[PDB]
């Protein structure tokens, strides 16, 4: 695939079987989704962004299906106005920022 | 150029001659830079990210040179923890996320 950036880079991912729309984000260190329930084996984490900081719930080894690929990656759950797949997953997929 | 997301993709841009480090961010609609003063000709706008909303000053037709490309575009200024070049800029440079 190729994402030209005219529209937001939005794709549907499957996190442990459940679909979600995610924004692929090159300026994100972590990936963070809201509105799914991933259980109780998480570690608490504090994540910062443009507006400030948020408590998040971190899960390691999550099974991710996106862009036909199937990764196991760390997913955080927290309050986000948009779900994001940050470099941790982008990297796993083999993505590149090109010019 | 290729930016393999194993490192934050930070680059140096010159905003009207002044150099600045910016993260190329696909997860950003707009470009926000802290620390430069661009004048009296602005429209106040509020932007949002994780953690919250931040007020900005919107400047139009700002001259930019980044990656041996010279472009003119919108730039906001605000108290951003890091300078962002968003989709409005990456689009103008003909950058893309490919897999």
């Amino acid at each position: 695939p190729q994402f030209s950036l005219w529209k937001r880079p939005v794709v549907t991912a499957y996190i442990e079987g459940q679909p979600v729309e995610v924004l692929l984000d090159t300026g994100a260190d972590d990936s963070i989704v809201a509105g799914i329930e991933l259980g109780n084996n998480y570690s608490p984490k504090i994540v910062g962004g443009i507006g400030g900081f948020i408590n998040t719930k971190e899960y390691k080894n999550v099974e991710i299906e996106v862009l036909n690929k199937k990764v196991r990656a760390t997913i955080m759950t927290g309050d986000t106005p948009i779900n994001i797949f940050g470099r941790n997953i982008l990297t796993a997929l083999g993505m590149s920022l090109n010019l | 150029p290729q930016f393999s997301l194993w490192k934050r993709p930070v680059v140096t841009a010159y905003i009207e001659g002044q150099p600045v480090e910016v993260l190329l961010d696909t997860g950003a609609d707009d470009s926000i830079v802290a620390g430069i003063e661009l004048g009296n000709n602005y429209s106040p706008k509020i932007v949002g990210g994780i953690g919250g909303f931040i007020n900005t000053k919107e400047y139009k037709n700002v001259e930019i040179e980044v990656l041996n490309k010279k472009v003119r575009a919108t730039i906001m200024t605000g108290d951003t923890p890091i300078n962002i070049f968003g989709r409005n800029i990456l689009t103008a440079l003909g950058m893309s996320l490919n897999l």
């Binding site: 994100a28 994540v47 962004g49 994001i84 | 950003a28 609609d29 990210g49 994780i50 923890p81």
Partner: peptide, 6 residues
């Protein structure tokens, strides 16, 4: 909307 996310 801008997602920095450090």
């Amino acid at each position: 909307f801008v997602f920095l996310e450090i």
